[PDB]
Amino acid sequence: CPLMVKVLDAVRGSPAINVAVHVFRKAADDTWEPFASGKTSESGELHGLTTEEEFVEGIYKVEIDTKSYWKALGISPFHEHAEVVFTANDSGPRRYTIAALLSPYSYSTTAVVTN
Amino acid sequence: CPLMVKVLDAVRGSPAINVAVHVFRKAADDTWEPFASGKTSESGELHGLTTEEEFVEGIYKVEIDTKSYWKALGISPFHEHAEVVFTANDSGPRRYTIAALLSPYSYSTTAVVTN
Amino acid sequence: CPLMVKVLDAVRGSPAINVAVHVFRKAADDTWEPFASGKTSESGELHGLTTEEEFVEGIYKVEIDTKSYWKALGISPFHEHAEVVFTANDSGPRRYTIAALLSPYSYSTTAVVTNP
Amino acid sequence: CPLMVKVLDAVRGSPAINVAVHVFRKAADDTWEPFASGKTSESGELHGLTTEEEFVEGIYKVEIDTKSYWKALGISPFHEHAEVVFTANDSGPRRYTIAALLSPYSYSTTAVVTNP
Numbered sequence: 466c467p468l469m470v471k472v473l474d475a476v477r478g479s480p481a482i483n484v485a486v487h488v489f490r491k492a493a494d495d496t497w498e499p500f501a502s503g504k505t506s507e508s509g510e511l512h513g514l515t516t517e518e519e520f521v522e523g524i525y526k527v528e529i530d531t532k533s534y535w536k537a538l539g540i541s542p543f544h545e546h547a548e549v550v551f552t553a554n555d556s557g558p559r560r561y562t563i564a565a566l567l568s569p570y571s572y573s574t575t576a577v578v579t580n
Numbered sequence: 581c582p583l584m585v586k587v588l589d590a591v592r593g594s595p596a597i598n599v600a601v602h603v604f605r606k607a608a609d610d611t612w613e614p615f616a617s618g619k620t621s622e623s624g625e626l627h628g629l630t631t632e633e634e635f636v637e638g639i640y641k642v643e644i645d646t647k648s649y650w651k652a653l654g655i656s657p658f659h660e661h662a663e664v665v666f667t668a669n670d671s672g673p674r675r676y677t678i679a680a681l682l683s684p685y686s687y688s689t690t691a692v693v694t695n
Numbered sequence: 696c697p698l699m700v701k702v703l704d705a706v707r708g709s710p711a712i713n714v715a716v717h718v719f720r721k722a723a724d725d726t727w728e729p730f731a732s733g734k735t736s737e738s739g740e741l742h743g744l745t746t747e748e749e750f751v752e753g754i755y756k757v758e759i760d761t762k763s764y765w766k767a768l769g770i771s772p773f774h775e776h777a778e779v780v781f782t783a784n785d786s787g788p789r790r791y792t793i794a795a796l797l798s799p800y801s802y803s804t805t806a807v808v809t810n811p
Numbered sequence: 812c813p814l815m816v817k818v819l820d821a822v823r824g825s826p827a828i829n830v831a832v833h834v835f836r837k838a839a840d841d842t843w844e845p846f847a848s849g850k851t852s853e854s855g856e857l858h859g860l861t862t863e864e865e866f867v868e869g870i871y872k873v874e875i876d877t878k879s880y881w882k883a884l885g886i887s888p889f890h891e892h893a894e895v896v897f898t899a900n901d902s903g904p905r906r907y908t909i910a911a912l913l914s915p916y917s918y919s920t921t922a923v924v925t926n927p
């Protein structure tokens with residue numbers, strides 16, 4: 466609800482289905498603690514990662530397992546994973562969507578932050 | 581229904597609202613004939629452009645009026661408009677979403693073609 | 696020097712070589728006049744399209760023939776071409792680099808504009 | 812020569828100058844070891860990070876300090892940094908260019924990989 470991930474495939478023109486996504490929260494000692502994870506749906510989306518109560522301000526990392534995705538399609542890719550690192554800020558709008566558009570040697574990512 | 585346009589703003593991290601979009605179909609003589617138009621909604625989307633009956637195979641152009649968008653925000657942009665030119669093909673999946681992610685001096689565009 | 700085009704392939708992780716590029720300029724009657732054309736090199740770059748004398752103020756369209764590129768590679772892409780339309784030189788001469796990063800169903804484009 | 816980083820600004824239409832870049836390499840114990848670092852030049856380019864001797868096979872992370880860039884411009888961006896993680900040189904030495912195109916709430920990144 467407060468956090469959604471959307472993943473698209475630029476080679477096939479389709480949602481990127483069954484992609485593993487792992488979310489981490491930065492701890493006090495600067496290590497990354499597991500926070501949430503799942504796999505994208507048939508629409509390329511992963512909902513239900515967290516709740517408003519748990520998603521407090523801090524630094525988060527969303528790791529999208531792109532290498533496995535491309536390998537399953539028989540395509541050799543560049544990156545190990547796509548990484549998106551950001552601060553959640555209570556001032557700003559309350560719903561974060563992290564989107565990524567994937568190619569074998571490239572990716573784009575954007576944030577849609579709305580109320 | 582068969583054609584949707586989605587426009588996002590990479591400067592503000594938000595849907596690009598009230599952006600004019602014009603769709604053209606290539607005519608026999610190679611001119612561009614007006615086909616559909618509208619303005620993006622509060623979610624950055626423009627639905628209802630065409631129907632399955634009218635959206636036959638052919639070459640289409642989607643022109644997104646980015647310059648006016650940026651000017652209304654007080655930002656000086658590079659492009660006159662973003663252009664997306666493609667062939668609609670009956671073989672492939674039946675629903676086309678044309679997405680564009682806008683910055684003042686850059687844009688990205690992708691197609692999500694699904695059934 | 697005043698206008699350069701750079702094209703990259705996001706599938707291969709390489710320059711996009713032998714990509715045809717056509718530039719047009721909008722005339723006073725609002726039609727698109729052919730202005731220049733060429734092909735990217737083995738570096739993905741196309742230089743020598745125009746001269747500072749010829750490249751006057753106007754609205755220019757840079758058409759990058761992406762479908763022909765992907766088809767010559769045996770691949771069926773979505774777009775016909777990538778089109779970049781911009782006003783040039785309206786505060787005096789500038790140098791423009793138009794870059795594009797290509798995938799079969801997507802592309803990104805940017806401009807680097809510098810003042811000599 | 813073996814590793815180059817190029818950064819562009821999608822807001823300004825310019826190179827992204829004075830962008831800090833940190834490269835790490837994954838150690839055998841699975842931690843990220845500092846490998847090299849530098850700043851982009853007035854061309855948006857960072858050269859001289861490593862040597863072909865030093866740049867052995869491994870998993871490398873290129874951290875581009877985008878937040879610091881946008882903040883030094885007085886702008887409040889979304890991301891902390893742009894991170895590019897890849898296996899390098901696992902079929903022998905290659906030359907890698909890592910490119911990034913930056914906006915306040917978005918970035919794109921690509922790689923050009925060539926065989927000397």
Ligand SMILES: *S(=O)(=O)c1cccc(-c2nnc(-c3cc(Cl)c(O)c(Cl)c3)o2)c1
Binds near residue numbers: 566679681688
């Ligand atoms: S919307 O939720 O209906 C919707 C439909 C289709 C596509 C999108 C979407 N979300 N993000 C993107 C996108 C992200 C990036 Cl990083 C880039 O470069 C592009 Cl071109 C699109 O598309 C939303």
Ligand SMILES: *S(=O)(=O)c1cccc(-c2nnc(-c3cc(Cl)c(O)c(Cl)c3)o2)c1
Binds near residue numbers: 804920
């Ligand atoms: S080259 O040095 O002459 C050159 C000039 C201008 C721009 C480039 C360049 N390199 N990469 C890119 C680029 C990267 C990405 Cl990730 C995206 O999305 C785009 Cl549109 C361009 O541009 C090289």
